[PDB]
Amino acid sequence: SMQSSKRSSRSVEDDKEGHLVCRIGDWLQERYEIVGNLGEGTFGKVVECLDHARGKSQVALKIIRNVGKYREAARLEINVLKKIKEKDKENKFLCVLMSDWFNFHGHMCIAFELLGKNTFEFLKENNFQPYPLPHVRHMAYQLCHALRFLHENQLTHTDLKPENILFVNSEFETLYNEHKSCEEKSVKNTSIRVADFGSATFDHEHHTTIVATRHYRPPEVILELGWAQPCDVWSIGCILFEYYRGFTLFQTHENREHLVMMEKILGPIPSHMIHRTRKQKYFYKGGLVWDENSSDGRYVKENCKPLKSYMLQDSLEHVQLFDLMRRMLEFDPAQRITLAEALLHPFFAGLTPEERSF
Ligand SMILES: O=C(O)c1ccc2cc1OCCOCCNc1ccn3ncc-2c3n1
Ligand code: NA
Ligand code: NA
């Protein structure tokens, strides 16, 4: 401790952007001691703290800028994290646990129990070599379990992506791959938690038009047809593909190209979704407008193949993963598999009793 807790907690000022001026060794609430930097953003900063009222246990503390639009968004996030904590008092459903929140001189602060690396960071540090199928299976099972509980409590996350899924502990072992003739990092424990509820929407609330990060965004969002819980199911199917291959299913940044890639990989969009959309400019006599011969057309033709073509092995457990991913990636959100149904899919017969029982 370079600093004393009472003195440090009262010595306070903001910068011109409305960030809290702070550094390692500072205190908040005479309770939280800053020991590391974890992230910065337009919203504020994230620091690692020791919680001196709970045995110096480690927390991630979000410190939101002293700016009204960020303060208000944080207040809405806190109200969602409160409703989740209230419905899962014993944390069986694998959501990040908000341990505390407070207003620090205009800065909204949100504490979470400290976890390991996110699932994107781990993949990146493994040179984008994919997770082995048993790890994909256990992670898929935890995602279905976590989001089924939110969905059955009238909530949709809307922004599921590998960066928002955190390992409880990301320590790995280094195994040598016979087939790759080169070494792979294998996480020792595949237990995960779902983070980032700042976009989560209840059934009765106003639904923003464009939700989810591009790669994880479903066709009903792109076509502006309305969205609900099935939006999260599509995102999970994209995430599973990415854990299994190490690259994104939809490598695009434009709506028309994205819908074309969905057709190349998944088959035709249902005609009723095309009929209903305002985005008629994407279509001609009911078909997507697309030049197969342009530079983008040649890229998509070479790179975007039917989903089953991406299987790495053709044993039944690989067939079962691909069947479940195809059901998560149904175009029509009303026919898309629900997470209550996904938990009964035969893919999950391959779990160990320990993985199944949590
Ligand atoms: O928004 C949430 O719900 C959220 C929940 C938990 C954590 C962070 C969060 O958001 C801030 C992300 O930026 C910091 C990234 N690094 C780390 C590192 C270790 N942990 N352990 C928990 C979190 C964490 N974040
Ligand atoms: Na201070
Ligand atoms: Na909802």
UniProtKB/Swiss-Prot annotation:
Q: Which residues carry this modification: Phosphoserine?
A: 11
One GO BP: protein phosphorylation
Q: Does the keyword Kinase apply?
A: yes
Question: Reaction catalysed by this chain?
Answer: L-seryl-[protein] + ATP = O-phospho-L-seryl-[protein] + ADP + H(+); L-threonyl-[protein] + ATP = O-phospho-L-threonyl-[protein] + ADP + H(+); L-tyrosyl-[protein] + ATP = O-phospho-L-tyrosyl-[protein] + ADP + H(+)
Q: What is the superkingdom listed in this entry's lineage?
A: Eukaryota
Extract one GO cellular component term from the record.
intermediate filament cytoskeleton
Amino-acid positions noted as binding ATP in the UniProt annotation, renumbered to this chain:
38-46, 62
Regarding protein family, the annotation reads: Belongs to the protein kinase superfamily. CMGC Ser/Thr protein kinase family. Lammer subfamily.
The protein in question is named Dual specificity protein kinase CLK3
Q: Which residues of the full protein are shown?
A: 127 to 482 of 490
